[PDB]
Each structure stands twice: as structure tokens, then as C-alpha cells.
Write a protein that binds this ligand. Structure first.
Ligand SMILES: [Mn+2]
Ligand SMILES: [Mn+2]
Ligand SMILES: [Mn+2]
Ligand SMILES: [Mn+2]
Ligand SMILES: [Mn+2]
Ligand SMILES: [Mn+2]
Ligand SMILES: [Mn+2]
Ligand SMILES: [Mn+2]
Ligand SMILES: [Mn+2]
Ligand SMILES: [Mn+2]
Ligand SMILES: [Mn+2]
Ligand SMILES: [Mn+2]
Ligand SMILES: [Mn+2]
Ligand SMILES: [Mn+2]
Lengths: 94, 82, 99, 105, 99, 87, 106, 97
DNA sequence: ATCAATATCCACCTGCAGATACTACCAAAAGTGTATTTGGAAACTGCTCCATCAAAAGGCATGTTCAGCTGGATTCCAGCTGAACATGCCTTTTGATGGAGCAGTTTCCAAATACACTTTTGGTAGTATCTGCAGGTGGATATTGAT
DNA sequence: ATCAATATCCACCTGCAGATACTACCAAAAGTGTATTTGGAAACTGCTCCATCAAAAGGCATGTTCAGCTGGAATCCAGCTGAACATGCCTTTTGATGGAGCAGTTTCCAAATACACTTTTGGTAGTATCTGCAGGTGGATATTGAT
């Protein structure tokens, strides 16, 4: 028997942070997993093309950023860029 | 009684679909037109799904086979893995 | 006189009813029957995961509902309230699903 | 030993995102910043949906988020709807909407 | 006594004329100004390869031509021969450009 | 040392005869008077979206010059693939 | 004397280049030897198919040189190539002559 | 300084052109189109094969991945003939050395 | 306007399918540390091509007049489709039951990678010279529209 | 039908931009050969979950009647939009110049890969307790449609 990875427990953690007294059905969790996987693929794919276009062999935080700008609508992209910049800063200092 | 399978997709079920689509009044010829459209959709998706099955050397069409096929046809479906 | 609603009244009632709910609207077994028949033309003696058939029905029903919305807009564009094959065809043509 | 997620202030798993990146054949190399940034963006997007879907549950007088609530949240949000325009949510149904010309009187 | 073609005759002649040819139908320099104006509002001090502007114009014209095709079908659906703003809007809605 | 004149109102450089010609190639026989402003609006949205993406590619490459490839890549990801200028 | 892998496969299209582009493109960790051969064959076949029909289009228009218009005519008039290239724009290709019947005078 | 070499499929497209229409030429703009076509189809097939290999936890793209990708991507007769020409080329290639 | 017939809503209740909280088990995965390699930022700069210039000119945009015929409003009515009700047919449930085949594990070799060295080639680059056909004219044929 | 105004056709021709032709060069590509590693096919198999089966239960699909009202056909007409004309402007074209910035080449270290080792974690499996809410009830009341 083998194990199957999922984002479930990470989705759940994020849920309790925004709505501490709110639960989520397993069907709805399946949807969230599909969501996280889809956006991952979209962003990774775009970052991949960016690197190739510029003859780069490395995907860095810079590629992830341009990819996010290309893929997310205005305000969603603004906050996402800020959240991403924040996490990389705190990761540098820590 | 002898019965074709696409004819198993009944008029009242097609009506309910139209209702959820916000349709108030339906022409008599719609039900056969719909079944034809339904068939092409299923054929296109199942073809690609089975193609994934064969490649994996399986005899069982999995939900993932379908999900991948749906993504190919630009009909991305959330909730069934992937 | 026995009670009778005007034509269109019950239809509007059904629209509100089904736009409120999320349950599938095609019978399961007849749909399962159709899928297996179509698959048979591509490869013989196939089996299906139950979740595979369900994925198909969800995708197929969601597709038809969306198509009916576009079809409705086409009928209304022609100042009708009755959808016709004419309307489905126009929608599919503009969608790029044909012609 | 402190995990990279903790080090980044994130709930989403940085190590896993990094592993998925290099095994996905997206490039030859992966900078250390990329899985942090990407994990952050994914966590933020998850939060935004869960927030809006949570509200949808509240409005429907439920405490448990189901598919329907996710659909209501996404299709009622202009940007989320655009982002997920070519996506069908299983068991989501549609928004209540009736063309004016179809209404009586 | 001065010659006049009936309304519609010259329009049909023009359809045949431009469906036969492949040249760009928007004037080159005005289109270039539009491109620079729009790009400038997004980022200052940009320069353009000449082929970049032409790539944009080839795409824009092919887009509009295709849109007018669908628009035409929408007007004909409404039993008109004259395209109107509501035809363009319908085509773009079904296309998923506004939906 | 010196700056270029201000660019404004250039959408009107897309004239009524130019729009009529495009409609003809699209098989249109008769055109209402309000089509021309509607078309300009639709064209501007299309152009803004393509240029925004193209310029985003430009900046990522740290260039000041928008290349044909920038445009082609932008068109590609907008689902409007273009042959004849590219890779 | 060396043999090119293309001649070894009986192909005009370059097997060596296709293999190189496959590895450089980050599609998978490993690329088998039959993969670039098969792919080069498919690409060559598709090229032949289009050039055949475009050459006919050129001939139909009393031209000996294929130009983009001929490529567009050949593609849009073939149901299957039209489908494969349904989201593609051919620069300087124009459109098919097509006037909706209802627009004609009676 | 030498400008770096810009590879294209031109001399191959041209060869196939002469096989198919010996007395027909092709303009550079038309050749430009053909180059875009080959690159596009290349990326499509390669991308589909990439996904395919990943869905099946394989680290190798073989001719079998390419074949399934061609069946998924190409319509009807085009798939039929492409598969045949591909199978033919591989069997021939392996029958040597 | 009244008033009867249904649909619809709200408050409350209860059984249970699905959510949860627990403890334990472990392979994989993530963190740590060290040694090695290398991608791509810097610096320098050659040289392509972009911006801007001028100037002449005619292709084409603008603006107006005119009225043909299209779109929009109105009326009318045959008939199609919605509502309702009466049957009765087969979808649904669920529960058990072989067993097909998915998937896990072990073995192992054909084929892939890494690498060093040799040869072949496709891509400029610099000129040099054909050639298909764009665009011009002229005159014969075809189309359109008035009568 | 006759005819006249005008577009359309097509043959003919000439200029030339762009295609074809050659040599020379060469850096990268491609091929060969040897050695070393390993992905995944093959064979066997356990356990999941799929197909089938019975078997009521009844919910829901089907057939029929009647008529409300919608779609489509016909008629009219104001005025929008097409055709043609006069006017002249601004795009197009052709060519030049400076220099911005793209891009080619080389040096070099910060960061990434590659192992080996240790520790943590997420997926897991039973096992038991819990609970949000679907579904049923009744009665209030809103809606619809008859007068
Ligand atoms: Mn501005
Ligand atoms: Mn280096
Ligand atoms: Mn009048
Ligand atoms: Mn009319
Ligand atoms: Mn067995
Ligand atoms: Mn050579
Ligand atoms: Mn000519
Ligand atoms: Mn192994
Ligand atoms: Mn009647
Ligand atoms: Mn009506
Ligand atoms: Mn003027
Ligand atoms: Mn400089
Ligand atoms: Mn744990
Ligand atoms: Mn309830």
C-alpha cells in the first residue's frame, strides 16, 4: 500500500485562521485541492516558459512573480505579489 | 420495450437542464437537438479518456483519465482528483 | 372551476427551484448506460470507476446548462422567449464548437 | 531544526512545493526563493476563497462549507470568477439569475 | 440620368474585393500612434521593433474581422442585414469575452 | 534632451472607412451608425490586454524595447496564436 | 563514413535537432531514441500535407510561388487542418470568400 | 562580432516542398509561416507527451508517449497517417546498425 | 375590490452519515552539514536598428446631399407548447458476492546517460545574377440599372 | 427585351524586389565508441472495488386533453444609412544620420546541486465519540388567479 499526498491539512489550517468556527465538507475539500493544484500548474508552467524564453535554466522568485502578474487579475495579483514578497523577505531574515 | 440509449436521456431531464439554464419556454425540436449535442460532447471526452486508459495499459477508466481529458478539451473540472 | 396556473408561471417556478439546487438532473443509470455504450466504440470490455462516471455526468450537465444559457440569450436576441435548434446552433458556432 | 514554512511564516508546505517544482520538469534548476514565493501565493489565494466561501455559508445559515458555497463565492467575485472562468465546480450549481424579459406582467 | 448603383450593390462589391485580398485595412501610422499611446500609459520610455507593431496590427485586424463575422451571424439571426452594437455584445458574451 | 509631443485621442485614427473595410472582409453588408464607436472600444480593450502582457515580458527581460517575440508570446497566452513573426 | 539518424530513419527532417530540442525543452528527465525519430516523422508528414494543398492553391491562382494567402486557403478549406489550426492566425492570409446567402440580391 | 546562429526548419521544409511540388517555390514570408507551424506543433506534441509521462510516473518520453500524444492532438485521418509514418520511421531506424 | 387554491416560508425536532479527536506506527520526506560545480550578473563594447528628420504628392478621409429600402411598430390569428392529471414502468436502493484487475513488490537487462574525440553541417556573410509577378495600359466582355 | 453606364476581365509588358546561386568560413552540432548506470517491463499476487444479482418501493416518465399565448406573417412608414461628389490633408515613400540599447564575449562568486546523515512529519489504520443539518412536521402567510 502507498500514500497519496494532498493539500487538505494545509487548507484546513488556513480555514481556521480566517473562520475559526467554520468547517468544510470532504467534497468541498476535494474542490480546494483541485484549485491549489490547478493554480500551481498554471504559475509553474508560465514561470517555465519565462525562463526558457530568456534562455535561463533557473526558475527563481522573479519568474514566479512575473508569472503571477501575467496570470492573476489586477487586485488578486497585487496582494499575491505582496504576500510573496513578504514571505521571501521573512525567509531571508529568519 | 426496445429503447436506444441516448433516448434514455429523457425530455423531462432535458427540461430540468434548460430550467437551471434559466430557460422559460422550449420548442419541441430542442430535445432531439440536445441529445445530438450531448452525444458529441461525451464522444469527444470519452475518446480522450479511453486514450489515457490504453496508454496506461489499463482496462478501467479512472476519474483521473476523465479529469485529464476534460482539461484537454478546456473543460477543467474541480473535485475529482488532480 | 378547478385551479390552473397560467402557462409560464410553473416554468418560472421551476427555474427558481433548479437554480437553487445542485443535484444532478439526469437519471444516473440511463446516463451510465449511455457512457458505456459510447466507450465501447473506442475500446471493448472496459470497466469504469464509479467516480469516473460521476465526473462525466457533472462535466456533461454543467456543459449543457451553460449551453442553455447562451441558447437563451440567442432566442431573446431574436425577440423570442422560446429556444429553438436555431439558437443552440448559433451559440455553438460562436463558441467555436463548430462551423 | 526549523521548517522553511515556519521560517517564511507560512502554513503551506515550502519543502513539498520545492519538490513538486523540480520533479515537474519546469526547469533545470530552482532558486531557493521560488518555492517560498509560490507557496505564499497559493496560501493567499486559498485564504481569499475560504474567506468568501465562509461568508456564503454564514449567509445560508450554515457552519460547514460545501461545494455550493465555493461556487457562490467565486461567481459573485469579479476577479475570482475571471481567474476560474473555464473551471467547473462539481456540485456547485449556478447563480440564481432570470432574464428580465421572461418575468411576468 | 447620372448613374447610381442601388444601395447594397457597392457594399457587396466591396465584400468580394476585401475577401479576395490580404492587405491590412487600417492605416499604418495611425495604428502605430495608438499602440504607442496605450503602451505609454502602461510604461514610459518604451521602444518598439517595427515588426512588433506589425505583429500587433496583424492580430488586431484578424481579431476584428473574425468578430464582425460572428456579429454578422447575430444580426442575421435577428432577421436583420444591419449589424448593431447589441450584435457585437452578444457575440462577445457567447465568446466568453464578457459572458 | 527634448521630449516628444503628447499622445492623446489616437483611437480616432481608427477611422470609419477603416472599420467599414474590416467589416467587409468579415462579410458585413450594412452597418449601423453606432458600430464605429463600439468597435473602437472593443479594439482598445483587445490592444491593452495584448500590450500589457507583451510589456510585462519586455520588463522581465530587463529591456526597453518591445520585440516581436514579446508580442507573439503575449498573443499565445491570450489564446490568439500568431504565425509569421516568431519562434 | 557516418550515417545521419535522419537517413537511418529515411527522413528529410532532422532527427538530431529534434532530439536536442526535446532534451533542452525540459519535457522529461530522459528521452528515448525512438522519440525524436517518431516526432520528426510526424512533423515532416504534416509539413508535406500542408505544402501539397498550398501548392494546389497556388496553381489554382496561376502562381508558381507559395505565399501566405495560399497557406491560408489550403488550411481553411481542409476540414482537419482547419480544426488543428483553429486558434491560429496566419499573417497576411486573409479570409475565405464567403457571403451569407441572405445578403445576396433577389 | 558574429551574430549567433538562428536555427530554422527552412532547408527541410524546402526539401519536402520539392518532393511534393518540384516546380513550385515558396516566399520567405510563407516560409516564415511554415517555421511557426512546425515549432508550434512540436511544442504541442512534446507538451502532451510530457504530461502523459508525468501522469504515469515515467521519467522517459519514448516513441509510445509521442504516439499517444499524436492521437490526442490530431484529428481523424491526420492522426491515422501521422501514426503510420511515425511507426514506419521507428521500425526502419531500429532495423539498422 | 373579494376570495379561494396552492405554494412558500419559518420554527422546531431528530436520526445519522459523515466529521472529529485519539493513539499508535513508519516510510518517506524534509532539515542539516559539507564539498563541489556553475549559471548568470558585471563589466566592456561592437554594431544592429530604432527614433527622428525632411520633403514631395496623391491616395484616401472628411463632410455633404439625396432618397432607397431597411428596421421597427402594429395588428392579427393559427397552432404549438405549458399545465394538469392518469397510469405504470423501471430507476433506485442496498446488500451481499465473486473476482477482475489495480497496484505493490522483486528481479534484472535493454537501453539510457556520461564522456572523450572526430567529423560533418547549417548558418551567416559577402557579393553576383536570375526571375516571378506587381502594377501599368488598353481594349474586349460582363454586370447592373433605367426604361 | 433594349441599351447605356460602368465594372470586370484578361492579355501584354516592363521594372525590380526578392529569390536563387557560390564561394568561403567555422562554431556548433552531430556521430562514434567505450564504459557505467538504471528505468520500467515482466512475472506473481494480494486486496480493493467493480459488476451483477435479486426485489421491492415508488418516484417519476409517458400519454392525453385543452387552450392560453406566443411566433410568424403581413402591412405600413419615418428616417437611417448607402452611394456619389467635391475638397484637400496627412499618410506613404524614400533616404539619411546619430546613437540607444540590444547583444556578444569574458571574468568570477554567490547560489545551486550533489551526498551522507539525522530527525521530523504527514498519511495511515483502527477505534470510538460527536454533531451539523437533511428531512419531516405543522401552521403562518404570501402568491397567484378566479371573480
Ligand atoms: Mn497617456
Ligand atoms: Mn558558466
Ligand atoms: Mn422617403
Ligand atoms: Mn423590413
Ligand atoms: Mn487476477
Ligand atoms: Mn553547407
Ligand atoms: Mn496583375
Ligand atoms: Mn530500478
Ligand atoms: Mn385559440
Ligand atoms: Mn408575439
Ligand atoms: Mn478634407
Ligand atoms: Mn550605449
Ligand atoms: Mn503527525
Ligand atoms: Mn430543511
Amino acid at each position: 500500500r502507498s500514500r497519496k499526498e494532498s493539500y487538505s491539512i494545509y487548507v484546513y489550517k488556513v480555514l481556521k485562521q480566517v473562520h475559526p468556527d467554520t468547517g468544510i465538507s470532504s467534497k468541498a475539500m476535494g474542490i480546494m485541492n483541485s484549485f491549489v493544484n490547478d493554480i500551481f500548474e498554471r504559475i509553474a508552467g508560465e514561470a517555465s516558459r519565462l525562463a526558457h524564453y530568456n534562455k535561463r535554466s533557473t526558475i527563481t522568485s522573479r519568474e514566479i512573480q512575473t508569472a503571477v502578474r501575467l496570470l492573476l487579475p489586477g487586485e488578486l495579483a497585487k496582494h499575491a505579489v505582496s504576500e510573496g514578497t513578504k514571505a521571501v523577505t521573512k525567509y531571508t531574515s529568519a | 420495450v426496445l429503447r436506444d440509449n441516448i433516448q434514455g436521456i429523457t425530455k423531462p431531464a432535458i427540461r430540468r437542464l434548460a430550467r437551471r439554464g434559466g430557460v422559460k419556454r422550449i420548442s419541441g425540436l430542442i430535445y432531439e437537438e440536445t441529445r445530438g449535442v450531448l452525444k458529441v460532447f461525451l464522444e469527444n471526452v470519452i475518446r480522450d479518456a479511453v486514450t489515457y486508459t490504453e496508454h496506461a495499459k489499463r482496462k478501467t477508466v479512472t476519474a483521473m483519465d476523465v479529469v485529464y481529458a476534460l482539461k484537454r478539451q478546456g473543460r477543467t473540472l474541480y473535485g475529482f482528483g488532480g | 372551476k378547478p385551479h390552473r396556473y397560467r402557462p409560464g408561471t410553473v416554468a418560472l417556478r421551476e427555474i427558481r427551484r433548479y437554480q437553487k439546487s445542485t443535484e444532478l438532473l439526469i437519471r444516473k443509470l440511463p446516463f451510465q448506460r449511455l457512457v458505456r455504450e459510447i466507450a465501447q466504440d473506442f475500446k471493448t470490455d472496459l470497466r469504469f470507476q464509479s467516480s469516473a462516471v460521476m465526473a462525466l455526468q457533472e462535466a456533461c450537465e454543467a456543459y449543457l446548462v451553460g449551453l442553455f444559457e447562451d441558447t437563451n440569450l440567442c432566442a431573446i436576441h431574436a425577440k423570442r422567449v422560446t429556444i429553438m435548434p436555431k439558437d443552440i446552433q448559433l451559440a455553438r458556432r460562436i463558441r467555436g464548437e463548430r462551423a | 531544526a526549523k521548517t522553511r514554512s515556519s521560517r517564511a511564516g507560512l502554513q503551506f508546505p515550502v519543502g513539498r512545493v520545492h519538490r513538486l517544482l523540480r520533479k515537474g520538469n519546469y526547469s533545470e534548476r530552482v532558486g531557493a526563493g521560488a518555492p517560498v514565493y509560490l507557496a505564499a501565493v497559493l496560501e493567499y489565494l486559498t485564504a481569499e476563497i475560504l474567506e468568501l466561501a465562509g461568508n456564503a455559508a454564514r449567509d445560508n445559515k450554515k457552519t460547514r462549507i460545501i461545494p455550493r458555497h465555493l461556487q457562490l463565492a467565486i461567481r459573485n467575485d469579479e476577479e475570482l470568477n475571471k481567474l476560474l472562468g473555464r473551471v467547473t465546480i462539481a456540485q456547485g450549481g449556478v447563480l440564481p439569475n432570470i432574464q428580465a424579459v421572461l418575468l411576468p406582467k
